[PDB]
Write a protein that binds this DNA or RNA. Sequence first.
RNA 1: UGUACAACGGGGUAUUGUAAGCAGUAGAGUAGCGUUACGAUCUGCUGAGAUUAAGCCUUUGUUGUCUGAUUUGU
RNA 2: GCGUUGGAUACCCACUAAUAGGGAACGGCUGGGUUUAGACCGUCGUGAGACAGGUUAGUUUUACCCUACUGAUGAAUGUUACCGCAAUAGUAAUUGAACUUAGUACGAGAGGAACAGUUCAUUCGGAUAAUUGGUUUUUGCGGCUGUCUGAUCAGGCAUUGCCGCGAAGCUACCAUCCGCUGGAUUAUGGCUGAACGCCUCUAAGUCAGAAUCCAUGCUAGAACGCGGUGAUUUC
RNA 3: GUGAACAGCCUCUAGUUGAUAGAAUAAUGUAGAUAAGGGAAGUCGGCAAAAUAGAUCCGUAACUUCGGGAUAAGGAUUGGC
Lengths: 87, 136, 386, 150, 131, 61
Amino acid sequence: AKSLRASSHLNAKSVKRRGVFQKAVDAREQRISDKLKEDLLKQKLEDLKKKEEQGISTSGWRDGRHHTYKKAKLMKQSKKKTSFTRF
Amino acid sequence: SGNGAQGTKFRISLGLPVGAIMNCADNSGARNLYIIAVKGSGSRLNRLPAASLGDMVMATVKKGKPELRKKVMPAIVVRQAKSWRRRDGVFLYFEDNAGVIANPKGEMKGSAITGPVGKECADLWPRVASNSGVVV
Amino acid sequence: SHRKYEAPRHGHLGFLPRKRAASIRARVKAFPKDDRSKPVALTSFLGYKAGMTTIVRDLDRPGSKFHKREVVEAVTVVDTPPVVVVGVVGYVETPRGLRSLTTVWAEHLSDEVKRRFYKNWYKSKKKAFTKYSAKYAQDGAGIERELARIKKYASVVRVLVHTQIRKTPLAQKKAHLAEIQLNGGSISEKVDWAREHFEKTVAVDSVFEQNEMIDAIAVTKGHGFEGVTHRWGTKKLPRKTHRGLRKVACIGAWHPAHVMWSVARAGQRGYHSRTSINHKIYRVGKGDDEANGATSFDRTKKTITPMGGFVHYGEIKNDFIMVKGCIPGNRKRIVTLRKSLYTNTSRKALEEVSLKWIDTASKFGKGRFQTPAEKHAFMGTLKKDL
Amino acid sequence: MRIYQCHFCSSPCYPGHGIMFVRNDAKEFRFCRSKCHKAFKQRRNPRKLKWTKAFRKAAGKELAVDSTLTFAQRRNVPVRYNRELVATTLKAMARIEEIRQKRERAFYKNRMRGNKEKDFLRDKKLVESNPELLRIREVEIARKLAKEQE
Amino acid sequence: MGRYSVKRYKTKRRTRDLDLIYNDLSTKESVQKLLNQPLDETKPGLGQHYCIHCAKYMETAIALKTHLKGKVHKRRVKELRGVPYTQEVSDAAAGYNLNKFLNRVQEITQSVGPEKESNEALLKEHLDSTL
Amino acid sequence: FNSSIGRTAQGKEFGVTKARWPAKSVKFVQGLLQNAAANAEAKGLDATKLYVSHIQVNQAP
RNA sequence: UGUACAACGGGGUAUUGUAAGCAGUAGAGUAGCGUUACGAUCUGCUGAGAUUAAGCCUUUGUUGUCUGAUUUGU
RNA sequence: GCGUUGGAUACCCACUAAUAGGGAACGGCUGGGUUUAGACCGUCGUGAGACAGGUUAGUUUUACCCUACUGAUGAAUGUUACCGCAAUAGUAAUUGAACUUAGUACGAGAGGAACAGUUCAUUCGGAUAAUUGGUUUUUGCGGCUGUCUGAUCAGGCAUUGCCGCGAAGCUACCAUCCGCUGGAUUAUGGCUGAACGCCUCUAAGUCAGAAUCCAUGCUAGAACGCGGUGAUUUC
RNA sequence: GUGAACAGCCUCUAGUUGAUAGAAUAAUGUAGAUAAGGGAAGUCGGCAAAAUAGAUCCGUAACUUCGGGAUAAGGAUUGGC
Ligand SMILES: [Mg+2]
Ligand SMILES: [Mg+2]
Ligand SMILES: [Mg+2]
Ligand SMILES: [Mg+2]
Ligand SMILES: [Mg+2]
Ligand SMILES: [Mg+2]
Ligand SMILES: [Mg+2]
Ligand SMILES: [Mg+2]
Ligand SMILES: [Mg+2]
Ligand SMILES: [Mg+2]
Ligand SMILES: [Mg+2]
Ligand SMILES: [Mg+2]
Ligand SMILES: [Mg+2]
Ligand SMILES: [Mg+2]
Ligand SMILES: [Zn+2]
Ligand SMILES: [Zn+2]
């Protein structure tokens, strides 16, 4: 028999795969994506009706807490000689 | 699936390991059949070859005509007592185990089969279907 | 000298060690490869295994001996209420591998998901994410900066979702939280999608559909400490052998003067992580469908829940997925449903399932009746009813 | 796909459930349950086992002959498919089930008439036969009421 | 489940069914064929001394006579007294093929029943005369 | 002295897995503690400030 | 201090196979004067009665409970 | 890479894709064997006895130690919690048949293929319990023998008394489901082309190509590998 | 009492209620059981288990020292009223 890793069987499979099977996958993808969009729109409409009843630089530190934490950690690694990249 | 068989065969619960004795359902003069081998059997250490309905076996006649005795011949299992699943949705079984004598092409030595024949065996073997009076 | 008769070894060396899984929620180890021109989509989903039942399928399979014939098959029902999107994680590529760069959460989380952050919820002051939610004030700087960081650097984008376990019959109130990869448009579109879907629900029919092959990832049922005969499937020793017959007779007869790692030994059985593939979705049932247990051939108005409910589970009141066959895990265990990692080239992945009938007889015994109206109509008038 | 009735107890046999035995005369015995199958193998009499419909019909516990019970029979001569005929059959099935249930209830009611009369006669005889216990009950009543009063 | 029931009513140790025995007794030709059998080497009593009610071969005529004088045979005779309980009874109790079942009961009461009773009377008196 | 002892969750307070509940030992030690408290009270020491500064177990014959 | 938790109870769903008690003119007959007495069993009230989470499902009821110990800091 | 059998008494019979050879001994239970005391027959011996021999019967009994192996906890590097990464180690699928190609290529004939497209099964592996089957201290329901509680009732005992059914749980090739696709190569077939004014698959360079290799996928996750994120104490 | 019975099983007189305990119910054991289909294919070898079993009646071969073999083998049956 031909193994699962047999080259000629995998070549035939790839030829088959590029056609009707990939067509089915793509069409299912389009249908599911449309349903996902309609689900979001329906949630927006429900929330809107319910609320009718009621009525950039990435430089620097992430925050001051992050600044203090990373500075203290790097100083500690320097002091204890536990750095992966520095001496 | 055997030479002379018509198409593929799906798995059936095994009921007749080697050393079993089934009845002879045809009219060739044999009374029972002793299974000594199973066609299409796999190989695994310590595992007995076993037959199910619609399998071809090699069998000897223990009771019946002395002309039929001391000879090893193909037989086809047409009934089994072990229950098996039909894909339509029922487990079923027969009263006895039974087989019929054939040649390696699966052609019937006898001219008729007494008693019911399992649908799986009849559908697998056209000559059994032609010699069957009752198909379940 | 050589072994006289050949036999394959007992068990599979690639499923080692046979130790208890580190978590009750089995990990997704690989997501499908991303195609950038495709629309944005979730790659997985979370559900709870509810039980099994029986169907009759009108099979169309050319070349098969059961072509144009009915088959009776086992199915598994997974209770899948919608998940709630609560966060987004960005991943960068490094020479050491993928690294999570940053995580952004939504402004408001339910107590259902806040319980996941506590060992003793009833005693706590429930302070989790209280200071974080204050970062959404005064035009949302910090939040916008971290989303900008995800857009600028991430090669992978995943979305943090959680189950709504309060809609299941389970006694557990603490929800399950997981990362689900977004396969779809660009990184910027993935992040915009996640930010738009914060605090929103995604239903299972916006992730899967009928006639689709999926993969089930779960922890198997535990069985405690097990002997070799049942843990590994070895042959029992002859009767009244000294010191037992549920053993391997010789654990080493050859030189290394150790026990080999490839020798069967007693230990833990079950509660391992497993990823089984190519289970066909037979039905995507909706929770508000009054006849989601009914087909075009069976005109009985009934739901999927069997009489008396699923044994040890309860009733199905949400959306559900019915996949044929069996999946790892026992009933009420959390399961992860994954999209296929490759395009299946078998024709069974192309077949369209047409169900003729769904079994709703009681699983608590030899159930003979599909509905209580049927049971009452068959039995007749009882002594108490008069 | 067809619903069969159990050979032993006449209960419905759905696909997958129960077991079938084929006798050498090609007769199928379908059983809904292991209970009924084991009873058949032990060769017990279904007309004597009280939990079977054969017994209940034989003993008259439920009505066996009615005009509603004649609509369902194995059809060996097929008819060509007609959509409106299928629709009329589907409506008729629900109507027939409703009428059969009403007549079943009436039959059980007629079978159980006289029960209240028997119960009243039994109660009267017991009350007539126990004067001492009734005196104890009256003393208990009077003491409880006097406790409520005071 | 228990060992006694398992080893007595194992499928390979099955006995003839009561409706089949009822059909065997209903017609005179079947009665005569079962009463007068060819010498078969593999049956007890060379195929002779066969009780139709119990579907059982006896080794000897004295064994058959002592069997006929027994509560086991009388139990079987009592069992074969009524309607032979086909699948039609279960179908009718479900409420299905009711007219067919009622026609079958009418035929038993009118024709097949009394003929079977007359055959049984003749068979019993023949066994009394020959034994 | 803990070779082949069972494991308990009450050991976590002290960072161990092996812990037991020896009743006879606890009762003897409680008796000696009560005696020590009695002696301190007889001396006039403040009972709220007393701590076990020494405790020793030796093998008897 | 609440779609709270628990113990019972209710309703389902399953299992077995028709409870106790009373009655009959059903009962091979036998004894005494068509009648009464004994009598395996049979029939009715009665798919009755019993069991049903201990690893079944559910819950507009009843009654209660919500309390201590220990340790952890850049 | 992957398999290499079931029997009968080294040879047969069969099944099978095939029933390949060998090593880790021959430099744990167990059967014949060193088989001590009993016994008989044979050969030798003057004899005690010995053997050219043959037959029958014949108690030696760890593990709780260390290590290895299988699984299971766990101190400590602010505390506590949630989501993750992936170094390394392991790794898995296999074989036969069937429809179509076709009664075609090929052939006087007799016979008679394959690729591409499809459907099942063998061995193995991992799960699973809707259904069928097995199992029953559910001692759940019912019954049976003997005896005991005056009888009825309701019960006890019979080393789980016995019989029938029996849910739940466990479980079976005795039940069901599921088990893939990218790079580099071997033999070999080539391209361009010297050595060598012919030629040459090779020297430099280069194209394909095996069930092979490395990966994808799958299992564990370094308890001294790591990242992201939440909360961080009023006597 | 049952029963052929000083058997086994249950009870009256009399006598004991002693033998480290508690909680859990993994593997492997020790002791005891049940199992679909097949029926010795297992093994050096049917080892071990299973199957048989009381009583009444029918019936019983070779061989033999005529005494036996013999419960040979093989069959029918068994409650209650
Ligand atoms: Mg072997
Ligand atoms: Mg169930
Ligand atoms: Mg120990
Ligand atoms: Mg010796
Ligand atoms: Mg690796
Ligand atoms: Mg091909
Ligand atoms: Mg398994
Ligand atoms: Mg008793
Ligand atoms: Mg050249
Ligand atoms: Mg770690
Ligand atoms: Mg068996
Ligand atoms: Mg052998
Ligand atoms: Mg062998
Ligand atoms: Mg003898
Ligand atoms: Zn039934
Ligand atoms: Zn008879």
